[model samples]
Target: MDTINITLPDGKTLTLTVTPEFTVKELAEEIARRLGLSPEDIKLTHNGKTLDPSLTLAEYGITPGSTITLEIKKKGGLE
Candidate 1:
């Protein structure tokens, strides 16, 4: 596949299109910076499953026109 356009994070009405190749954490890294949030405190799940920070979207089977659901974690919740 040439590209996938995800609906980005879920804390706001945020969306973007990208010819992307990146991991969830660093992408979260960038997002948190602009959103005035903390990357380490943000959680992203693709559709239903938990997405590993070490894996890229391609690795998670993320596809075109999908949602990368976001959750804020300010506590000590282990998974």
Candidate 2:
């Protein structure tokens, strides 16, 4: 099992244990559920780069002990 730490915008941290094959979308959904938010509301990043939900942790080069940032996507109209 690989463990990764996710830091939320509120400064709260969440730890997740997953396999290398775990998808980003799965992680987002888990975090959203934990925060009582929709999966679409969650945005994940690593090293200042946005994460692609269609990919797996291994595809994104995410490993055990990796730290990711979680942000809430803003709901707004196009300017």
Q: In TM-score terms, which candidate is top?
A: 2
lDDT of 2 by residue, 1-79 (tens): 4677888878878887877656888877876787889877687878889887777778877778767777886757978
- What TM-score does structure 2 among the candidates reach? 0.81
Per-prediction TM-score, please?
A: 0.67, 0.81
Find the number of clashing residue pairs for candidate 1: 0
lDDT of 1 at 62: 65
Which residue pairs of candidate 1 clash?
none
Residue 17 C-alpha lDDT in model 2:
87
**Model 2 spans with C-alpha error above 4 angstroms:** 76-79
RMSD of each: 4.7, 2.2
Residues 1-79, candidate 1: write the lDDT tens digits: 3433334345355655443577787777776786798877777766577777877867766665664567775566777
